[PDB]
Design a protein around this ligand. Structure first.
Ligand SMILES: CCCCCCCCCCCCCCCCCC(=O)OC[C@H](COP(=O)([O-])OCC(O)COP(=O)([O-])OC[C@@H](COC(=O)CCCCCCCCCCCCCCCCC)OC(=O)CCCCCCCCCCCCCCCCC)OC(=O)CCCCCCCCCCCCCCCCC
Ligand SMILES: CCCCCCCCCCCCCCCCCC(=O)OC[C@H](COP(=O)([O-])OCC(O)COP(=O)([O-])OC[C@@H](COC(=O)CCCCCCCCCCCCCCCCC)OC(=O)CCCCCCCCCCCCCCCCC)OC(=O)CCCCCCCCCCCCCCCCC
Ligand SMILES: CCCCCCCCCCCCCCCCCC(=O)OC[C@H](COP(=O)([O-])OCC(O)COP(=O)([O-])OC[C@@H](COC(=O)CCCCCCCCCCCCCCCCC)OC(=O)CCCCCCCCCCCCCCCCC)OC(=O)CCCCCCCCCCCCCCCCC
Ligand SMILES: CCCCCCCCCCCCCCCCCC(=O)OC[C@H](COP(=O)([O-])OCC(O)COP(=O)([O-])OC[C@@H](COC(=O)CCCCCCCCCCCCCCCCC)OC(=O)CCCCCCCCCCCCCCCCC)OC(=O)CCCCCCCCCCCCCCCCC
Ligand SMILES: CCCCCCCCCCCCCCCCCC(=O)OC[C@H](COP(=O)([O-])OCC(O)COP(=O)([O-])OC[C@@H](COC(=O)CCCCCCCCCCCCCCCCC)OC(=O)CCCCCCCCCCCCCCCCC)OC(=O)CCCCCCCCCCCCCCCCC
Ligand SMILES: CCCCCCCCCCCCCCCCCC(=O)OC[C@H](COP(=O)([O-])OCC[N+](C)(C)C)OC(=O)CCCCCCCCCCCCCCCCC
Ligand SMILES: CCCCCCCCCCCCCCCCCC(=O)OC[C@H](COP(=O)(O)OCCN)OC(=O)CCCCCCCCCCCCCCCCC
Lengths: 44, 43, 103, 114, 110, 64, 74, 196, 218, 113, 88
């Protein structure tokens, strides 16, 4: 899902090509942390 | 090759996605202030 | 661009690059970034999990690796049910306490 | 238990009853608050005129005629009644029911002696 | 906690009795309640000079007290049946079933 | 480090003690309260509201 | 187009630790303890409450400067 | 010294375990390209790559207590430490090459956005002096790197195949007029012929 | 209740009270429609089933309850004038900044965001950046300012506090106007006898404390 | 002779002076007139402790006293007017003003900046 | 949350009164509770501080305050009888 979204953005947007796989992985980690925080907090 | 508790992992992923979408979109918890004009009244 | 603006832009970009390099490669800052990177790797790629690839024979797989999911489910369900029962008990206790205190 | 229509009827009726009780409270409180303001203003004026107290800036100072102040008389009589009738009230480490019984007995004694 | 705290502690029996009496009153003396709400809606009648609503509030309270004080024997019997059914429903911790709508309707039609 | 922390704690205790002394002196500066008769037989002092009477001059009659 | 949707876990995160399965029971115990503490505090705060409305519940208001709050009838 | 014993045991275990994998990790890094040398570890499988990266610094810096070490054990620990230092140097070299590759790719992306069909707002017919000079200096540095990598035929071949691809794309992206001969003088010697 | 819009208060004798009543009656219809809509939404969401409803009715429909409370208090107040906001500035310096975000009083432009965007535009012009890039860098700070501006239910909470304060102040003012004539005569002797402007309640409390401390019990 | 070392020492001195100012302000609020009883105590140990822990305050007060003395001398020279309030000798004046710390009673470095 | 539980939050703010009391009697009780007397200034001081030790519910608060008001009213009447001069 996240991989597919990143792939579509990379293949369609020329400017997105600047980001490295390392930067993509950092965004992935931040997104996973934020999703976990959202799931936990919504029940609090 | 064997994956332990693969069915459990699938169900956990599905439940996580369902809960995240539920909370993000509030699809089940709609708003009816728009429907109020188009509703009858009692008392 | 105009050559004067080119001089200004070159100076600005060189300053930005030098600042970034100094902040990243400074001793204490470098150590902090290194340890934080390894910690983030551990947190993301080695979080607690219930499903994993089993590359060991049933004779070489522990019973914990076979009943961990059941143990976790039991723990979580028992915690939730016990919390619900404690909520009911607290409700009853408060009701009785205040009723006997007055009205 | 009951239909939602009946539940909402009950909710509305309870809201009305609560509002009526609030109306009673507001009426009584407003009347007694006007009376209290009038009484306090008159007491302050009487004290200032008689010289019992001197009111300057944001402070009240004891005057030469302090002993004749109506507030002083009220305080003395309050102490006298708390001694004669409502004795032991200040330090009564009893149960709530015992405290209520003590208050009732004190009220009865005051009524008898009045 | 976000839920409001309770002011007066009502026993289960008292709560059920007051609820049933409130439902009965909302039918018996709705006119007085409506007049009281109308008089208390205004700023002058709500905050500044609430005393003007005192008579209407007294009338509404008298009507509610009359409703609470079941005078007719049939009314007392219907209220007792409804209250017993409500007590059973409340005390039924097991999966709940039939409702008390029939008994409520009989008490309201009494 | 331990003795420096102890010295800081001692200075804080000194400040707190002087504040307590000032407030207690202010409380004692008030006129004495004479408890006689019923009040003397039933002193107002109680653990529930002792802070109201702490460091307050009271003239009380009793049997030592 | 290519079909890609699937609920199956990714093999990148399915690795085990050297000593056996991943640290699941320990983290579950920690989470249970944290949830117990949190819900106990919430229940204690929620259930043991009452609202007392009387004269002693009101105190004189003051500004952020500490002075008593009074507004003129301008 | 219980604390010293625990520290030495941890250091030995981690260092030896990762020294046994440094060969595979470096082989995978060499196999992968310069755009994302850690692409395999990030996407497919992290074969102790992050562990090596983390524990290289510890091997370099943290002290040792020989009295807690044996003879063969100490020799093995020294060998593992040297292997980890070599891995650190290899990673630094790979990072430098990757950053140079991304510099060239940034130039290529700047050119591509200029010729993009969607670029209805920043369409420029003639290449400008700033980017021309950037291309010239980047090509000069690439030629210098190729010369410096003469003693490592495999490294030179990989550097060509990876980095010079974008240089060839830049060459193709512009017409052969203006300052083009001077800009691509060094490239035309060998590199242009290779990318044909 | 469909209250009439013609206030029954005498403007000649109770001007502020008449004005307050007129404003309240004028806005009552609209605020009552909004309150009815909110209440209907709440009750239908409660009537919903399982996760679509009752199971999580009281705890997750918090914004609706907050809006209902704000609407009720604003209906009771009728209208808000800048004088009262300045008065409450004593305890809440940002009272206006919170009331503007709580109520639809005036259209709010992200002035700070637009200024930052203009600065980025100047930077882009100086360094010869594309117009698309500078337009994006103008939009981004505007979006950040709008995101940080809208929402902010803490502003709604502070608006509720301010509205409670204002309602109490208006009730006290109405009582003052009602009893001004009655207290006129007493007011002159109080002005001629007491040179302090402090409140009668505060002075009487201080006098009670002074009596309790200094007066002999006897 | 290093700029980095100079800046670090200056920052440390600023933090120490701010902490001393806060401590002195609190102690003065508590000892409006009795602060000297503890600040200038005859005990050598207490005197040394106070001087060491308020060195930034004492050096700042010394600099302020020197500056005020020189400024007053300049004013007297230019205007042929009076003395430095009184005819206090240089040693007495400087010692008195350096020992006096009440000048920092309402002063906080962070607030001033 | 069901209506059976929600209605509790609307039943709680209603004070409990005997069903045989008229509205006039309830209003008289409220008037007696809110009554004002000069001597209240000190009797209130001596009463509320004590009542803080026992008040945990609104019913207890109501009962204690009503008894305090009744005592204060009796004391006010006795004081008026004793000191007719201040009230002429
Ligand atoms: C109300 C709440 C608040 C809302 C606002 C919230 C904003 C939050 C912050 C946004 C920050 C965005 C910028 C960072 C992302 C990355 C950008 C980037 O790569 O930078 C370099 C890249 C520029 O690269 P370049 O080298 O200059 O371009 C050549 C390369 O070839 C180009 O190669 P490329 O493929 O890489 O470039 C594609 C580039 C796109 O750039 C382009 O190539 C062209 C952009 C303009 C297109 C204009 C339309 C052209 C005609 C199409 C047909 C339309 C017909 C309409 C009429 C129909 C009638 C039936 O695509 C993007 O920008 C990607 C992100 C786009 C989405 C996010 C931005 C949304 C902004 C919406 C508001 C715009 C302002 C108000 C406008 C309305 C006023 C009335 O982007 C920019 O620097 C520009 C950024 C975009 C500026 C705004 C343009 C308008 C966009 C409208 C989108 C509408 C979508 C519908 C939903 C809208 C709901 C609100
Ligand atoms: C400076 C450092 C660097 C900073 C960088 C910036 C970012 C921040 C990084 C910081 C590091 C932490 C980040 C969070 C971790 C991220 C993990 C991740 O991305 O992994 C992706 C990776 C995704 O891989 P995948 O291939 O997509 O697989 C995922 C599928 O979901 C496959 O999932 P699965 O199948 O493996 O499922 C997961 C497994 C995981 O479960 C566990 O083992 C965990 C359990 C919970 C334990 C919680 C422990 C918490 C301890 C806290 C202690 C206090 C901390 C205080 C800190 C103070 C500061 C010192 O769950 C279960 O076992 C399911 C349990 C379901 C229970 C069902 C109950 C049924 C009851 C009924 C019983 C039967 C009744 C029958 C009645 C019959 C009547 C007829 O995830 C995993 O593989 C791991 C699983 C996911 C774990 C999520 C953990 C999130 C934690 C968030 C913590 C936030 C705390 C914030 C604190 C703020 C304080 C101010
Ligand atoms: C507000 C909430 C905050 C908390 C939540 C946070 C959540 C978000 C994540 C945060 C991530 C970012 C953290 C900030 C970055 C830290 C960077 C840093 O430390 O800088 C040093 C680093 C310098 O070290 P270096 O250059 O890497 O090393 C060469 C130096 O010459 C040094 O040479 P040396 O050989 O003399 O010294 C080596 C070592 C000092 O060496 C020693 O004296 C021995 C240390 C222990 C070694 C490991 C023995 C383990 C034994 C087994 C334990 C088992 C426990 C029970 C479990 C059993 C079952 C599994 O000193 C260090 O460098 C210490 C680094 C940190 C600890 C490293 C050890 C990790 C493993 C043990 C702890 C975790 C438990 C694991 C259990 C499982 C193990 C299988 O850079 C700096 O100097 C920067 C300073 C400025 C930055 C801030 C400094 C903060 C200092 C914190 C110290 C904490 C000590 C541990 C406390 C434990 C309390 C329970
Ligand atoms: C403006 C402030 C921004 C601060 C950012 C946060 C602090 C730094 C990160 C600390 C570690 C975080 C945890 C690990 C996450 C994963 C790291 C990772 O994989 O990143 C690399 C990955 C590779 O990208 P790259 O472009 O090739 O590398 C960066 C370029 O070299 C260079 O491009 P550059 O643009 O990054 O250049 C630097 C530029 C920065 O440019 C910007 O303006 C950045 C704009 C984006 C901001 C992103 C904000 C993310 C917020 C979450 C951060 C996680 C920690 C906090 C968690 C709680 C948050 C509530 O300016 C600076 O130097 C910023 C100040 C740096 C001072 C760092 C002080 C020590 C660390 C203190 C925090 C440690 C946590 C302590 C926890 C508590 C302990 C008690 O970089 C990214 O993820 C891209 C985004 C940048 C992330 C932050 C900077 C990472 C620097 C890592 C350099 C490593 C050496 C390079 C290879 C050398 C081989 C020989
Ligand atoms: C709880 C409250 C307090 C929290 C304090 C947190 C403090 C964190 C500070 C971090 C400082 C920097 C660390 C640098 C690394 C140094 C250590 C090291 O290299 O690892 C050595 C040791 C083994 O490493 P290794 O040899 O390289 O093994 C990996 C290789 O792949 C080789 O692998 P292998 O196959 O050979 O197997 C080796 C196995 C070996 O593993 C072990 O031996 C460790 C097993 C676990 C612990 C076992 C012992 C348990 C008892 C401990 C008793 C301690 C008592 C302390 C008493 C103190 C009294 C003063 O390694 C593992 O499996 C690693 C496990 C990693 C676990 C990651 C957990 C992530 C999730 C955390 C959040 C969960 C929230 C869920 C909520 C969901 C609710 C629905 O690793 C660890 O110590 C694991 C540390 C992982 C946790 C660190 C990050 C925690 C951050 C939490 C979130 C906070 C966010 C807050 C906001 C952000 C701003 C504040
Ligand atoms: C609040 C703001 C709202 C604004 C709304 C704006 C809506 C914008 C919708 C854009 C749709 C997509 C096209 C633009 C973005 C493309 C991005 C992309 O990846 O494309 C790159 C590519 C272009 O790049 P490329 O093809 O060179 O590919 C890149 C190749 N390299 C890397 C080698 C350089 O695709 C396009 O841009 C295609 C553009 C097609 C344009 C079609 C226009 C149709 C106009 C119809 C008008 C109809 C009028 C009818 C009137 C009737 C009257 C009666
Ligand atoms: C030009 C414009 C450009 C725009 C670019 C924008 C890019 C944005 C990229 C980031 C955002 C992506 C959002 C994707 C949608 C959300 C998906 C989601 O919620 O899941 C995230 C992830 C799982 O999904 P994903 O990793 O994507 O797919 C894996 C397939 N196997 O979930 C995680 O990994 C989170 C961690 C938890 C996972 C579930 C764990 C098990 C669930 C049960 C937990 C039980 C806990 C204890 C018990 C509680 C209950 C009692």
């Amino acid at each position: 899902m996240f991989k597919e979204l990143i792939h579509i953005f990379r293949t369609y947007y020329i400017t997105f090509r600047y980001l490295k796989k390392s930067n993509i992985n950092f965004l992935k980690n931040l997104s996973y942390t934020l999703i976990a925080y959202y799931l936990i907090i919504n029940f609090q | 090759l064997p994956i332990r508790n693969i069915q459990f992992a699938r169900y956990h992923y599905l439940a996580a996605v369902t809960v995240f979408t539920y909370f993000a979109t509030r699809c089940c918890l709609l708003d009816y202030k728009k429907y109020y004009p188009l509703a009858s009244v009692k008392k | 661009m105009n050559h004067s603006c080119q001089k200004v832009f070159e100076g600005f970009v060189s300053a930005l690059y030098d600042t970034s390099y100094f902040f990243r490669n400074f001793g204490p800052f470098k150590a902090t970034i290194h340890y934080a990177t390894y910690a983030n790797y551990l947190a993301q790629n080695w979080a607690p999990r219930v499903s994993y690839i089993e590359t060991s024979t049933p004779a070489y797989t522990l019973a914990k690796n076979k009943y961990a999911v059941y143990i976790v489910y039991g723990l979580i369900g028992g915690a939730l049910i016990h919390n619900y029962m404690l909520d009911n008990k607290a409700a009853q206790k408060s009701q009785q306490y205040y009723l006997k205190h007055r009205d | 238990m009951f239909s939602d229509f009946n539940m909402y009827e009950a909710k509305v009726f309870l809201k009305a009853v609560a509002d009526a009780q609030n109306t009673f409270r507001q009426t009584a409180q407003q009347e007694n608050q006007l009376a209290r303001y009038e009484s306090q203003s008159q007491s302050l004026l009487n004290g200032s005129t008689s010289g019992a107290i001197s009111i300057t800036g944001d402070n009240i100072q004891q005057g030469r005629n302090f002993k004749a102040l109506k507030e002083v008389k009220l305080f003395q009589y309050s102490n006298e009644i708390f001694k004669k009738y409502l004795a032991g009230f200040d330090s009564f480490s009893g149960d709530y029911t015992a405290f209520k019984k003590f208050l009732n007995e004190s009220v009865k004694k005051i009524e008898q002696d009045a | 906690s976000i839920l409001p705290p309770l002011q007066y502690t009502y026993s289960n029996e008292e709560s059920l009795e007051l609820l049933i009496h409130s439902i009965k009153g909302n039918k018996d003396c709705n006119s007085e309640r409506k007049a009281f709400n109308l008089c208390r809606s205004t700023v002058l009648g709500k905050h500044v000079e609430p005393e003007k609503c005192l008579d209407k509030a007294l009338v509404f309270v008298n009507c509610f007290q009359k409703v609470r004080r079941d005078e007719s024997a049939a009314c007392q019997s219907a209220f007792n049946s409804t209250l017993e059914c409500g007590k059973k429903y409340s005390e039924s911790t097991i999966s709940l079933g039939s409702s008390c709508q029939s008994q409520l309707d009989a008490y309201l039609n009494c | 480090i331990g003795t420096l922390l102890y010295g800081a704690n001692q200075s804080s205790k000194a400040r707190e003690n002087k504040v307590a002394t000032e407030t207690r002196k202010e409380r004692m500066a008030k006129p004495t309260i004479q408890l006689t008769g019923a009040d003397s037989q039933n002193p107002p002092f109680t653990e529930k509201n002792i802070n109201d009477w702490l460091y307050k001059t009271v003239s009380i009659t009793g049997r030592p | 187009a290519r079909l890609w949707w699937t609920l199956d876990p990714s093999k990148y995160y399915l690795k085990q630790i050297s000593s056996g399965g991943r640290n699941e029971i320990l983290f579950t115990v920690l989470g249970v303890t944290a949830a117990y503490w949190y819900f106990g505090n919430k229940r204690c705060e929620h259930y043991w409450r009452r609202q007392i409305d009387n004269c002693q519940s009101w105190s004189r208001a003051q500004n952020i400067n500490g002075n008593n709050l009074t507004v003129k009838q301008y | 010294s219980l604390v010293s014993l625990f520290k030495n045991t941890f250091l030995k275990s981690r260092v030896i375990g990762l020294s046994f994998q440094a060969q595979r990790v470096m082989a995978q890094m060499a196999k992968t390209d310069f755009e994302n040398p850690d692409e395999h570890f990030l996407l497919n499988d992290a074969m102790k790559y992050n562990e090596l990266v983390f524990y290289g610094r510890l091997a370099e810096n943290w002290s040792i207590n020989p009295e807690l070490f044996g003879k063969a054990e100490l020799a093995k620990y020294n060998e593992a430490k040297q292997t980890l230092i070599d891995f650190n140097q290899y990673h630094a070299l790979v990072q430098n090459l990757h950053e140079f590759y991304w510099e060239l790719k940034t130039i290529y992306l700047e050119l591509s956005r200029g010729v993009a069909t969607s670029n209805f707002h920043n369409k420029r017919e003639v290449t400008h002096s700033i980017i021309e000079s950037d291309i010239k200096n980047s090509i000069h540095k690439y030629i210098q790197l190729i010369d410096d990598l003469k003693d490592y035929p495999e490294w030179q071949h990989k550097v060509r195949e990876e980095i010079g691809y974008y240089a060839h794309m830049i060459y193709t992206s512009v017409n052969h007029d203006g300052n083009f001969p001077e800009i691509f003088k060094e490239f035309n010697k060998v590199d242009s012929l290779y990318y044909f | 209740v469909r209250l009439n819009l013609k206030s029954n208060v005498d403007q000649n004798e109770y001007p502020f009270l008449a004005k307050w009543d007129k404003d309240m009656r004028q806005n009552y219809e609209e605020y009552q429609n909004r309150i009815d809509a909110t209440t209907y939404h709440l009750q239908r969401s409660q009537r919903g089933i399982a996760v679509f409803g009752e199971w999580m009715y009281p705890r997750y429909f918090q914004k609706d309850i907050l809006e209902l409370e704000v609407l009720r208090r604003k209906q009771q107040l009728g209208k808000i004038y800048p004088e009262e906001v300045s008065s409450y500035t004593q305890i809440n310096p940002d009272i206006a900044n919170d009331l503007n975000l709580t109520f639809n009083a005036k259209l709010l432009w992200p002035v700070r965001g637009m200024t930052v965007g203009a600065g980025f535009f100047a930077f882009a012009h100086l360094f010869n950046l594309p117009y698309s890039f500078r337009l994006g860098l103008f939009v981004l700070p505007t979006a950040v300012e709008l995101a940080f501006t809208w929402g902010n239910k803490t502003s709604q909470f502070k608006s509720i506090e301010f509205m409670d304060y204002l309602l109490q102040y208006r009730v006290s003012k109405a009582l003052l106007e009602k009893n001004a004539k009655h207290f006129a005569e007493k007011k002159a002797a109080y002005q001629k006898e007491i040179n302090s402007s402090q409140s009668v309640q505060d002075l009487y409390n201080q006098l009670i404390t002074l009596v309790s401390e200094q007066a002999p019990s006897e | 002779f290093n700029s980095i070392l100079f800046l670090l020492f200056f920052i440390v001195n600023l933090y120490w002076f701010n902490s001393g100012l806060i401590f002195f302000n609190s102690v003065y609020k508590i000892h409006h007139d009795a602060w000297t009883l503890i600040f200038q105590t005859d005990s050598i140990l207490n005197k040394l402790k106070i001087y060491f822990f308020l060195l930034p305050l004492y050096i700042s007060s010394f600099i302020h006293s020197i500056s005020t003395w020189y400024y007053n001398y300049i004013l007297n020279f230019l205007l042929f007017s009076e003395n430095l309030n009184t005819n206090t000798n240089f040693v007495d004046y400087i010692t008195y003003n350096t020992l006096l710390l009440s000048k920092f009673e309402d002063f906080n470095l962070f607030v001033y900046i | 949350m069901k209506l059976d539980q929600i209605i509790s939050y609307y039943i709680t703010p209603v004070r409990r009164f005997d069903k045989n009391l008229t509205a006039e009697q309830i209003y008289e009780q409220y008037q007696q509770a809110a009554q004002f007397n000069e001597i209240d200034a000190f009797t209130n001081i001596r009463f509320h501080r004590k009542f803080k030790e026992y008040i945990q519910t609104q019913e207890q608060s109501d009962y204690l305050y009503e008894k305090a008001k009744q005592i204060s009213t009796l004391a006010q009447k006795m004081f008026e009888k004793k000191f007719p001069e201040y009230y002429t």
